[PDB]
Design a protein around this ligand. Structure first.
Ligand SMILES: CC(C)CN(C[C@@H](O)[C@H](Cc1ccccc1)NC(=O)O[C@H]1CO[C@H]2OCC[C@H]21)S(=O)(=O)c1ccc(N)cc1
Lengths: 99, 99
């Protein structure tokens, strides 16, 4: 679909069999989700945002479904203000910016 | 044009008679630019993201040219790691997400 930006580009995602709301975020390299239980092993990592750096749990090769489109990649879990879908997954679903 | 998301969506912008590089950021409500000494009045503001909040100066009705597309609106100025063009101006240049 084509998504205009008059309001936040919020979409429903499916991860770990649960539905959630997330923000399509072209300014994010990586995908960062709010605290949640995800299966599989994870490694401690750090990620930096506008306000500094936070501790996150890095899950690799996670299946996420974004508006029906499937992606399999890295998901960082930690104290983010919002579920953000970053470019690592936006590329998988074939997302581009157009003006 | 069409901007893919393999790499950061960096574009050249023109603000206050200066050329800068900035992210086209669908995850930013409002445009935030690295510290610069714009003339005119401003209002204090705090904006938050990953890592917490930063203090910024809110200027209104600032003209910005993004890849030849002119826009005018709110520009926040502060110690951001990156110039980001937010939805408040992305809508003005006709920018959409497409997948
Ligand atoms: C977290 C979002 C809901 C909001 N952010 C925009 C977002 O695109 C930032 C924009 C951004 C980009 C680079 C550096 C700082 C902030 N990206 C970001 O935090 O990404 C992190 C996860 O992937 C990594 O890649 C970049 C940093 C990491 S934000 O920078 O904090 C922000 C908040 C409010 C406004 N008006 C403008 C910007």
């Amino acid at each position: 679909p084509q998504i205009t930006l008059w309001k936040r580009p919020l979409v429903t995602i499916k991860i770990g069999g649960q539905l959630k709301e997330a923000l399509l975020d072209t300014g994010a390299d990586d995908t960062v989700l709010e605290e949640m239980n995800l299966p599989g092993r994870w490694k401690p990592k750090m990620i930096g945002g506008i306000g500094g750096f936070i501790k996150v749990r890095q899950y690799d090769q996670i299946l996420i479904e974004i508006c029906g489109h499937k992606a399999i990649g890295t998901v960082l879990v930690g104290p983010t203000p919002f579920n953000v879908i970053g470019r690592n997954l936006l590329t998988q679903i074939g997302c581009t910016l157009n003006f």
